Amino acid sequence: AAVGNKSNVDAPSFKGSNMELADSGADYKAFPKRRMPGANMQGFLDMAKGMKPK
Amino acid sequence: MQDIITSVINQYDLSGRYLDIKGINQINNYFDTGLKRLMIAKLINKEATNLIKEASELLFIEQPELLRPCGNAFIGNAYTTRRYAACIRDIEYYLRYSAYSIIAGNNSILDERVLDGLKETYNSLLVPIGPTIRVIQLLKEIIQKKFSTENIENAIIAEPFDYLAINLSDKNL
Amino acid sequence: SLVTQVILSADDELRYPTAGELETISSYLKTGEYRIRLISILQGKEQEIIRLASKKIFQLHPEYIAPGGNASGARQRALCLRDYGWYLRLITYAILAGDKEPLEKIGIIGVREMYNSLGVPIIGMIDAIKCLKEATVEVISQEEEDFVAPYYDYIIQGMS
Amino acid sequence: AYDMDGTGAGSLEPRGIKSSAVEKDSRCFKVTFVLPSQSRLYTFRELQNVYTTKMVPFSSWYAEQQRIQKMGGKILKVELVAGGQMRSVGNQ
Amino acid sequence: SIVTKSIVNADAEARYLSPGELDRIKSFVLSGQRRLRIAQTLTENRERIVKQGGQQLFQRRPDVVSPGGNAYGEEMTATCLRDLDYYLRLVTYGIIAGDVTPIEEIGLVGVKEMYSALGTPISGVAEGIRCMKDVACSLLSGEDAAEVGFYFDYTLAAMQ
Amino acid sequence: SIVTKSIVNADAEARYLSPGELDRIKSFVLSGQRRLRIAQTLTENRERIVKQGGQQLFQRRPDVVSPGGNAYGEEMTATCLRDLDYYLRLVTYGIIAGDVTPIEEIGLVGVKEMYSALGTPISGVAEGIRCMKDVACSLLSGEDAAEVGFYFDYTLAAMQ
Amino acid sequence: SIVTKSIVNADAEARYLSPGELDRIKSFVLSGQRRLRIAQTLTENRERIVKQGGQQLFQRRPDVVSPGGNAYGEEMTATCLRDLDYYLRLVTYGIIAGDVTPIEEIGLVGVKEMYSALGTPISGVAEGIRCMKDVACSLLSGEDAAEVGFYFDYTLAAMQ
Amino acid sequence: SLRDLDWFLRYLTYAIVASDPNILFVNIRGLREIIENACSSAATIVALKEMKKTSLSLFPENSIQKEIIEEYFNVVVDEFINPALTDTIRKRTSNDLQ
Amino acid sequence: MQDAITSVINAADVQGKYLDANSVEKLRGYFQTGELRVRAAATIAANAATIIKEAVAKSLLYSDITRPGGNMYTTRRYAACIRDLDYYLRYATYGMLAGDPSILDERVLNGLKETYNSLGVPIGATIQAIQAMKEVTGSLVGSDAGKEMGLYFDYICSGLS
Amino acid sequence: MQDAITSVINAADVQGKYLDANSVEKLRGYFQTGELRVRAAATIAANAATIIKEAVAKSLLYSDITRPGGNMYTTRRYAACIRDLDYYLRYATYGMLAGDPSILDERVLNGLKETYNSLGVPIGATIQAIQAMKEVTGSLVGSDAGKEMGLYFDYICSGLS
Amino acid sequence: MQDAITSVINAADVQGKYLDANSVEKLRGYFQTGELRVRAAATIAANAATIIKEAVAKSLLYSDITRPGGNMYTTRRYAACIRDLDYYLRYATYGMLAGDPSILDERVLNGLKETYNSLGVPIGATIQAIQAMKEVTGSLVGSDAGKEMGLYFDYICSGLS
Amino acid sequence: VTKASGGSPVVKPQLYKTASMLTIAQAEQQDRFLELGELNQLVSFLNTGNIRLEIADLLTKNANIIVARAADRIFVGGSAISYLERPQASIIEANSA
């Protein structure tokens, strides 16, 4: 199914959200995509909750 | 290696002259603190297996990352007990060669037997240099806890541990 | 002993003892009897001291005394004081021959595998010697116990 | 060349084992000895038989016999299997 | 510091240090008692100077913390305050060194390459340091606030 | 055999046998029923495997049997087939031992020294074993011919 | 040559050259006039020494040239004589060097690995060099034939 | 304690996926000694023998898989209650070495 | 500095012979993949900054080389990394187009491991950064194109080791 | 020195996580080809001398490296080749079983191209020998097994280049 | 160093004959006990330290060789024992798997009694330690497996006597 | 400060063995192709294969059940299983069991 029907305008793409299913997530890289804190850093995460909501 | 004495005598041999009184004043400063340099050393032998244990918990209490998985950086911190067993072993050496070097009154034994290739060895195994130097001075504060009421034993204890700190640094300034 | 270390250490270089080493023999032999006078003080306090060692090694570690521990039972505890007696006897040897070899050729070299094949916790034996050194301070004055102090903590360093 | 060039005390190469072996010596002993290691209990290496009987040359018997006693060995028997005695020329 | 670059200045010129250089090394070391007091104030006020520093930073730049901002979520906001703890630390070094030489080769040289390569808005981190400056100078007198603020605005200048 | 060199491997390494070594001694002894059947086929087929073995050997290498060849004459040609009976026997040992260890130290170690010292063309005897291999694998199924032929070609490899 | 290995002999022994070594370098260089005459005879007799060399080689080893032999056809037989031209050349080097050192590290070290890996019967090429030896010694007097033949049989020895 | 009750589930599920139990043996030999002061050791042997009792709920016993993973649990728990190996020493022969 | 065509011409020229069937056989094999390499080098040029940002965050972003004392602490030192990683992703793009890794050791590999030892740069973390950078590059250009671009990454990692 | 299982365990361990579905997914893929690799390593062990004899005769047997002056002239130098080619056919067999080329650069590739330049060994003729050796190896073990054994040959040729 | 299969092949080979019905008759007898020996060698590997701890405590733990003056007083000398008893329990495990005691005299028995006399090690207490070690080994592996493992212990005790 | 440098080659320290692993290394150290005994060594552990692998997933899937049932035994105080923290490296993910 393509549903190409008619009047395929270009401008005004709006907002909202959907988050479609991944794939191909069946491959196999050995490393993750990295993050940051943990150890050495629990102090500041707990502490950026403080301003998170501001 | 070279103690404070032999290092002093090589100082006057290179110039090929006898020992003057400025040379002998340097030797006398060792002979005065020489009796004080021993119970510092004798305290370390009595406090050796302890002083490594307080250093480790004081280290990992600030660096919990060292007891965690490395990340994909294959880095040698104290992840596994095989890693932890050898990693406590390095604290043995830093306390040991910094114990002889307290008695020699000179850091000649330090660099040629500890510093030479230290950044070589740790760069191979990807070992932490930052936390490795911080544990060296956790020992320094821990040892200075015992001799604290006066302050002339403190400069003696600080000299070996301070020398490893300045020398293991990649120089930021 | 100390002269044996100088004869050996000078023998692997195929030379007579140098100027510094002959000091090390001469100074050791001039402090001769004071080790001899000291060991007779400790031999008269072996029943003194091991009774005090069993004070604190077991109030510190009731795991070993309790039913299930290694030292549970009379005959297990019977040799328990014997190991203190041999260690204290060894230290009198080390205090005399002014070095660590009688504490090292006996007692220290291979001690962990001895205890590990016996069931004695090797950490507990470290506290036993540390307990023994804690017990020797009371029956000994301040002059001579720091003479015997470095011979004890070598054993603790040897056992780890 | 041979081990007796003029080396003795106070000479540049370190004072060591000096054998009375000629140029390319062809004398060799048949020795027998036990040599307990006395170092396995802090190294924990594998164990090897210490009772050996082997042919050591005359060029290096003295070093070996000087070393077998270094580590507490006992020499049960040695012989000069190959070579002559009191031979001025011909040990080569 | 002022001591090291007053040397390397006169080092390059093949000469010793003038009175203009040696009456300021002299003037700086007598200033050293007052510098450690100023750095001692910022040392154990990092809890408020950083947390209130990120206070005004998010109120002035909600984009960086909003969804899509670089410091979005519990994770990045913690690192969002981590950098402010870095730059607050370097200002304590510059106050004791009497110069931005510590701040120069740490956190300033090539800083635009890092933050451009991290996707972070470099103007946003400049806004963060300015918010820390008002908190820092509010903790000190007027004679000190002309110094502690003085090192922040240099960091503001080099960070854009 | 696989049992003796899986031992002497782990013997040298100061260790016991791993699961990789003990799950194959296990896997080999359950294979032992099938090995004796395979060796039983070659045992009483030596009349055809050898005689047809020397069949193709002379048709492919008439030089060795022609006048001047090493195996020239009725009472040698007999020894010409004797060696093939040897090597056919060693392959029966290798099949039951599960390895060329019997074939290694018999008929393979230093084989070039013997045949060079006998004047025999070592390449010619290699051709003889290959002719025996086609006769041997023609007597067994495909699952077996991957083994019985498998030991011949090892003998072919070491014999040149 | 005799000059280079009489040096490297005395080189390893940390000494100079004895009269036994220097009265032979002396004796060899006075021999040098006679050596070049001997090598000059074999130099422009390679047409007969090689072609008659392969003459007796095929009459004594028809297998290697027969169909199935390694040197079969117009192609391999040309290379069959090429190797004899090689080894005849190395003998001219050994005669002028006064030693098989040129023949050692060329055409002798690891020669069995090459010819075994080429499928060539190494015994066959040894037969070729022997046939060249009878042609070579037939071209010289008795005093010379004890040399020119002397280097061939060394090549015969190392080639089996 | 939950992190290590985690990990005992882990190198076992690395020893099954690998060939041998060797990775368990390296990381469990001196382990009980190191944590012996902040842990009652018998509070580990109870917890380690609960994983085999739980993991044996999964398979029809006297099938092939039942004997495989059972043998890997008793390699780690019985060797857990086992004295740590002694440090190997490298004493040097002459002065300049260390 | 030779491409696949330069290397084919050199070997065919170094024997003084013409381009026979075997030399042109490889050249035809290179022209077949000519369409794949340009599109591979196309997307890598577009996502150069994005690939390097993905590799460092996936390999060595939070490790203690990033923290104080680690080899990457100061901002000059951090900025040198992404400058340094840009060459590996760039020169690998050149090898992917030229079809020959001669440019890498000519302009990257020689004096490289001898230089990092001078500065004290950890070769271990460097290769894992390139390995992670190789992993993201296979994401963009696809499988076979990632096999091509990946074939020069480990060439850098091998020689840099 | 890691196999496919060692590399899978390392990457799953280096993040401190268990063996999830993706890590076991590749491990199942390796166990499926476990039967193919042993038979591939079986026949290569049998025909080791025959494969090397076929490669040198097909690639560099009669070229002028074989003649005087060429890089392979003397018998010591010729004998070093088949000794040298034996390692490439042997270590490639190890990579084919382990399913990971880590053993090659660990024990073959490092200091290899830097060593041939010292001796003056022609890298061009070396790779073509390995390419010809790869061609005969696909003859014995079949197509897909040749694809597996061939996948480590060009890995040697790539890094050795 | 021969197992039961090696010894059967040797005797059948040393007469130059094939493996007749009598040679295969013993080989079938060895394959029948192949399942028993592995499980016997399995549990002995598990309880190696426990078996040696049981033997010394049951035979020579409190005797006066243990007390000052006997040849097992010092800790080096005590530690040599359990090192020494480990070989007897280990090499006996090898004989139990190989089904032939050739490995014992090859690697244990030769120069053994001649060595203990040199050191002054009491052969009497040694055999009783092995006898007690044989007694506990029959506990673990069962009766018939203990009969097999026990058959090589007294072989050591016989030759060591 | 150290005024010289030997260099730091990349070295991967050993971590463990596997049955697929050491037998590849044993014949490697003897300088030989593995033989049919050792080729029979590498094969039937691969033939173990999916049996080893499925033991992981069945064990990995109910990992919490394996860990929790130990928590009921030797930890007083309610559940006391909240302190688990399965991802131990602080990564966003690549994939999760």
Ligand SMILES: CCC1=C(C)/C(=C/C2=NC(=C\c3[nH]c(/C=C4\NC(=O)[C@H](C)[C@H]4CC)c(C)c3CCC(=O)O)/C(CCC(=O)O)=C2C)NC1=O
């Ligand atoms: C006398 C001076 C001297 C030192 C210091 C020294 C260190 C040294 N540390 C080593 C390993 C190691 N060192 C550590 C140490 C650590 N891991 C961390 O995460 C922490 C930062 C740190 C503990 C403070 C680890 C984990 C290894 C093993 C690396 C691995 O195998 O993964 C090794 C390799 C193993 C071996 O010893 O053979 C050496 C040689 N050698 C010397 O001669």
Ligand SMILES: CCC1=C(C)/C(=C/C2=NC(=C\c3[nH]c(/C=C4\NC(=O)[C@H](C)[C@H]4CC)c(C)c3CCC(=O)O)/C(CCC(=O)O)=C2C)NC1=O
């Ligand atoms: C000269 C050096 C030297 C020592 C030390 C030595 C020790 C030694 N300790 C032993 C036993 C033992 N040792 C202990 C010891 C203890 N239980 C505790 O709680 C304590 C901490 C510790 C004693 C202070 C126990 C309980 C046993 C009996 C274990 C058993 O057989 O069940 C045994 C077995 C036989 C015997 O008791 O004589 C020896 C040989 N041998 C030596 O040659």
Ligand SMILES: CCC1=C(C)/C(=C/C2=NC(=C\c3[nH]c(/C=C4\NC(=O)[C@H](C)[C@H]4CC)c(C)c3CCC(=O)O)/C(CCC(=O)O)=C2C)NC1=O
């Ligand atoms: C440390 C204990 C110890 C000793 C004593 C010892 C002796 C010893 N003396 C030797 C030879 C010798 N010893 C002598 C000695 C003598 N000729 C005479 O007429 C005198 C009676 C005597 C001098 C007092 C001679 C001449 C040789 C050389 C024998 C030869 O070349 O055949 C050799 C043969 C190797 C060599 O010298 O390099 C040894 C090993 N080795 C040891 O380890």
Ligand SMILES: CCC1=C(C)/C(=C/C2=NC(=C\c3[nH]c(/C=C4\NC(=O)[C@H](C)[C@H]4CC)c(C)c3CCC(=O)O)/C(CCC(=O)O)=C2C)NC1=O
């Ligand atoms: C001492 C000098 C110095 C600085 C400054 C420094 C910065 C630095 N900032 C980082 C990340 C970061 N920095 C930010 C920062 C921000 N987000 C915002 O919205 C704000 C505008 C801003 C903070 C006020 C974020 C969100 C990350 C994580 C980016 C990512 O995960 O991709 C990282 C990577 C992770 C790490 O290792 O910490 C470094 C190295 N390093 C240094 O050595």
Ligand SMILES: CCC1=C(C)/C(=C/C2=NC(=C\c3[nH]c(/C=C4\NC(=O)[C@H](C)[C@H]4CC)c(C)c3CCC(=O)O)/C(CCC(=O)O)=C2C)NC1=O
């Ligand atoms: C078990 C391993 C083993 C082998 C292989 C072996 C071989 C062997 N082959 C021999 C002879 C011989 N072998 C041959 C063989 C051949 N002629 C040809 O043309 C063919 C190429 C080839 C056979 C296929 C000939 C002709 C002789 C006699 C040579 C002579 O009389 O000078 C002899 C000397 C006579 C004897 O004692 O039998 C031995 C020992 N011995 C062993 O123990």
Ligand SMILES: CCC1=C(C)/C(=C/C2=NC(=C\c3[nH]c(/C=C4\NC(=O)[C@H](C)[C@H]4CC)c(C)c3CCC(=O)O)/C(CCC(=O)O)=C2C)NC1=O
């Ligand atoms: C200087 C020392 C030296 C030698 C000896 C040498 C030999 C040598 N012999 C060769 C071939 C060959 N050699 C032969 C030789 C023979 N066929 C027979 O039947 C006879 C027994 C024998 C000659 C008397 C044959 C047939 C080939 C070609 C083999 C083939 O095409 O497969 C080749 C390969 C082709 C070539 O490059 O020439 C070399 C390198 N190289 C050297 O550097």
Ligand SMILES: CCC1=C(C)/C(=C/C2=NC(=C\c3[nH]c(/C=C4\NC(=O)[C@H](C)[C@H]4CC)c(C)c3CCC(=O)O)/C(CCC(=O)O)=C2C)NC1=O
């Ligand atoms: C994969 C195999 C493996 C394990 C299990 C392992 C454990 C390990 N547990 C540790 C500590 C610890 N482990 C525990 C607790 C426990 N541990 C248990 O096995 C019980 C379930 C529980 C007690 C009931 C505690 C409380 C500490 C902290 C001890 C300390 O403060 O020193 C440490 C020191 C670093 C740290 O603080 O975590 C290691 C290295 N290492 C390994 O390589």
Ligand SMILES: CCC1=C(C)/C(=C/C2=NC(=C\c3[nH]c(/C=C4\NC(=O)[C@H](C)[C@H]4CC)c(C)c3CCC(=O)O)/C(CCC(=O)O)=C2C)NC1=O
């Ligand atoms: C296991 C990984 C590994 C490899 C690959 C290796 C190679 C290696 N090849 C060498 C020589 C050599 N290699 C060759 C090879 C060749 N000549 C040619 O024309 C061809 C292109 C090529 C054959 C394919 C030759 C001729 C020599 C001898 C060089 C000389 O004597 O100068 C040498 C010098 C020492 C010796 O052979 O004993 C080493 C160390 N070492 C290793 O550890």
Ligand SMILES: CCC1=C(C)/C(=C/C2=NC(=C\c3[nH]c(/C=C4\NC(=O)[C@H](C)[C@H]4CC)c(C)c3CCC(=O)O)/C(CCC(=O)O)=C2C)NC1=O
């Ligand atoms: C694999 C075959 C094999 C054996 C068996 C073997 C034995 C052997 N036992 C030794 C010592 C020893 N063995 C013992 C044993 C004992 N003391 C007793 O009272 C008991 C009766 C007995 C324990 C059962 C002792 C105490 C020593 C040390 C002797 C000494 O230091 O003088 C030594 C001297 C070196 C050393 O231990 O490092 C060897 C070589 N070597 C071998 O290759």
